[PDB]
């Protein structure tokens, strides 16, 4: 629809979620950990071998941002690596404006 964000809402995390797609066959939690391991531990960390994708939770914006920069399209196992945000456009609200 539209782009960027209304300025939503602060938390006492932050959003710094990303998704990973096409994974190999033989990736584990492990190596998850240590493909990752340059932007320290990660507070989540998931692995779904019937669909064939992935999840990861960073500490920081700065440190998911970094992540995504570095990752994106990188060669693991002979396959080519997705790396995106999990959230990233901002759901509806409630202001209309005059003019």
Do not use: W
């Not at 998931?46 to 440190?63: M, P, S, V």
């Not at 941002?65 to 409630?94: W, Y």
Request: proline share 4%; net charge positive.
């Amino acid at each position: 629809g539209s782009s960027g964000s209304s300025g939503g809402e602060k938390t006492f995390t932050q959003r710094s979620r990303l998704f990973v797609g096409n994974l190999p066959p033989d990736i584990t939690e492990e190596e998850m950990r240590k493909l990752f391991e340059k932007y320290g531990k990660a507070g989540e960390v998931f692995i779904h071998k019937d669909k064939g994708f992935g999840f990861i939770r960073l500490e920081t914006r700065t440190l998911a941002e970094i992540a995504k920069v570095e990752l994106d399209n990188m060669p693991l196992r002979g396959k080519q690596l997705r790396v995106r945000f999990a959230c990233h456009s901002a759901s509806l609200t409630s202001g209309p404006s005059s003019g």
